[PDB]
From a paper:
The two structures at 1.95 and 2.74 Å resolution were designated Form I and Form II. Gip1(146–310) consisted of seven α-helices designated α0 to α6 from the N terminus. Among them, helices α1 to α6 formed a cylinder-like structure with a centrally located hydrophobic cavity 22 Å in depth and 10 Å in diameter. We noticed that there was a tetrahedral area of electron density at the entrance of the cavity that extended to two long regions of electron. The lipid was surrounded by one water molecule and 22 residues that mostly formed hydrophobic interactions. Second, our solved Gip1 structure contained bacterial glycerophospholipids, which suggests that the hydrophobic cavity is stably formed even without G proteins as cargo. Asp208 was one of the residues affected most severely by the substitutions and formed hydrogen bonds with both the side chain of Arg212 and the main chain nitrogen of Leu308 at the rim of the cavity entrance, which connected the C-terminal tail with the α3 helix. For example, the hydrogen bonding partners of aspartic acid, the 208th amino acid residue (Asp208), and Arg212 were Leu308 and Thr304 in Form I but Tyr303 in Form II. This structural difference resulted in a slight change in the cavity shape and entrance.
Therefore, Gip1 is a regulator of G protein shuttling between the membrane and the cytosol for wide-range chemotaxis. Gip1 consists of two regions, an N-terminal Pleckstrin-homology (PH) domain and a C-terminal region. The X-ray crystal structure of the C-terminal region of Gip1 shows cylinder-like folding with a central hydrophobic cavity. Mutagenesis and biochemical analyses indicate that the hydrophobic cavity and the hydrogen bond network at the entrance of the cavity are essential for complex formation with the geranylgeranyl modification on the Gγ subunit.
Author numbering: 145 to 310
Amino acid sequence: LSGLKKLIPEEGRELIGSVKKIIKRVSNEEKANEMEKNILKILIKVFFYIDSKAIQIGDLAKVDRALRDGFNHLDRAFRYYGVKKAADLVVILEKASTALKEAEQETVTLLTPFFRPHNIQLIRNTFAFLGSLDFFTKVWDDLEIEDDLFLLISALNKYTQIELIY
Ligand SMILES: CCCCCCCCCCCCCCCC(=O)OC[C@H](COP(=O)(O)OCCN)OC(=O)CCCCCCCCCCCCCCC
Ligand code: NA
């Protein structure tokens, strides 16, 4: 995992660290390690084919928008984190989940010419876990304040209005 991590900067590594800690808290260390590796693998591949120009920046638009939508809805729901129960926030969290499903599909479409079918399934499983409404509701109801959802959302919500990759 050394090289994959030196292929993304400190900012991204901190984002992935926050996600990984939350995943640890909601499931287990094995799933957290698998999801960290999967996120790194998908990211590294996308960046690789952007840089080699096998993928054009315009082709990324669909994923970009979807991700930002997802982030935005999480930000909206995070406004009520600690003052409303997750059941009262499903209408927001569902939209986040749906947005990430869109990102999932488009990432699959983006990487089909370059990923073996097993790694396409890896994309599906990774996005399905990270974008799961069950994951979100568990996070919004059952986390301690020390689990630092604030760090993740407060890092994500800076990116909702500007293209993620340009
Ligand atoms: C698994 C998802 C894979 C999606 C792959 C396709 C889309 C890729 C686009 C990624 C853009 C991210 C930029 C962010 C800033 C940054 O960190 O930017 C540094 C590098 C890129 O920098 P650059 O030099 O390219 O700059 C670009 C031009 N300025 O980004 C990264 O390290 C990616 C880090 C991603 C970590 C995501 C973790 C959360 C995702 C799921 C949400 C789960 C919520 C859980 C709620 C409890
Ligand atoms: Na796209």
